[PDB]
Design an enzyme around this catalytic site. Structure first.
Site, PDB file in Angstrom:
ATOM      1  N   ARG A  29       0.831  -1.173   0.000  1.00  0.00           N
ATOM      2  CA  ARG A  29       0.000   0.000   0.000  1.00  0.00           C
ATOM      3  C   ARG A  29       0.894   1.261   0.000  1.00  0.00           C
ATOM      4  NH1 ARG A  29      -2.347   4.367   0.442  1.00  0.00           N
ATOM      5  NH2 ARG A  29      -4.544   4.691   1.049  1.00  0.00           N
ATOM      6  N   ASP A  34      -3.502   8.707  -0.797  1.00  0.00           N
ATOM      7  CA  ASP A  34      -4.751   7.944  -0.934  1.00  0.00           C
ATOM      8  C   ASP A  34      -5.348   8.196  -2.306  1.00  0.00           C
ATOM      9  OD1 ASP A  34      -6.925   6.208  -0.189  1.00  0.00           O
ATOM     10  OD2 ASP A  34      -7.978   7.946   0.638  1.00  0.00           O
ATOM     11  N   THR A  35      -5.484   7.152  -3.095  1.00  0.00           N
ATOM     12  CA  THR A  35      -6.214   7.298  -4.365  1.00  0.00           C
ATOM     13  C   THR A  35      -7.688   7.006  -4.084  1.00  0.00           C
ATOM     14  OG1 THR A  35      -5.605   5.038  -4.934  1.00  0.00           O
ATOM     15  CG2 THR A  35      -4.229   6.823  -5.866  1.00  0.00           C
ATOM     16  N   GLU A  37     -11.525   5.358  -4.116  1.00  0.00           N
ATOM     17  CA  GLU A  37     -11.960   3.976  -4.025  1.00  0.00           C
ATOM     18  C   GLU A  37     -12.528   3.455  -5.344  1.00  0.00           C
ATOM     19  OE1 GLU A  37     -11.422   2.219  -1.056  1.00  0.00           O
ATOM     20  OE2 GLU A  37     -11.809   0.651  -2.558  1.00  0.00           O
ATOM     21  N   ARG A  81      -0.526  -5.289   4.687  1.00  0.00           N
ATOM     22  CA  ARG A  81       0.027  -4.650   3.458  1.00  0.00           C
ATOM     23  C   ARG A  81       1.354  -3.968   3.769  1.00  0.00           C
ATOM     24  NH1 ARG A  81      -4.931  -1.130   1.144  1.00  0.00           N
ATOM     25  NH2 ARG A  81      -4.680  -0.247   3.298  1.00  0.00           N
TER      26      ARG A  81
END
Ligand SMILES: Cc1cn([C@H]2C[C@H](OP(=O)(O)O)[C@@H](COP(=O)(O)O)O2)c(=O)[nH]c1=O
Ligand SMILES: [Ca+2]
Length: 135
Positions: A29, A34-35, A37, A81
């Protein structure tokens, strides 16, 4: 910090990729970003989710050499992750996404903030350009 070799197995979405790391398959990760969802039904398919996915896929799939760089803090999340900066031919995927306005700076904690100002600057610039997420 130091970069370690890894091999792409599969791009999963904008900020999550499966890699061969030290001979074992592992989900990574991307640190500090943050991309949007594309998988979880709670949030739904968020705007620029598919675009972030395709950007990361092309970047990692097209690379000759993938490297992972762990930060000075915790190296895995609670979901197992690996948490790292990923480089595709020396270019940081985490930074590329932010600069393209396809991820926001996020989850900066637990000691993993080496690239915070680099990424925040990329974000400010994408914001100024009203690029993608910031359009
Ligand atoms: C990037 C990152 C995410 N996470 C966790 C926080 C979130 O947990 P919860 O989902 O339990 O709140 C989740 C966000 O990642 P995703 O954007 O992949 O969902 O991953 C970390 O714990 N450390 C990190 O460095
Ligand atoms: Ca995400």
């Amino acid at each position: 910090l130091h970069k370690e070799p890894a091999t792409l197995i599969k791009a999963i979405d904008g900020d999550t990729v499966k890699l061969m790391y030290k001979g074992q398959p592992m989900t990574f990760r991307l640190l500090e970003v943050d991309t949007p969802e594309t998988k979880h039904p709670k949030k739904g398919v968020e705007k620029y989710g598919p675009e972030a996915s395709a950007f990361t896929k092309k970047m990692v799939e097209n690379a000759k050499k993938i490297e992972v760089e762990f930060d000075k803090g915790q190296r895995t999340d609670k979901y197992g992750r690996g948490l790292a900066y990923i480089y595709a031919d020396g270019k940081m995927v985490n930074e590329a996404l932010v600069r393209q306005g396809l991820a926001k700076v996020a989850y900066v904690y637990k000691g993993n903030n080496t690239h915070e100002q680099l990424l925040r600057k990329a974000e400010a610039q994408a914001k100024k350009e009203k690029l993608n997420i910031w359009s």
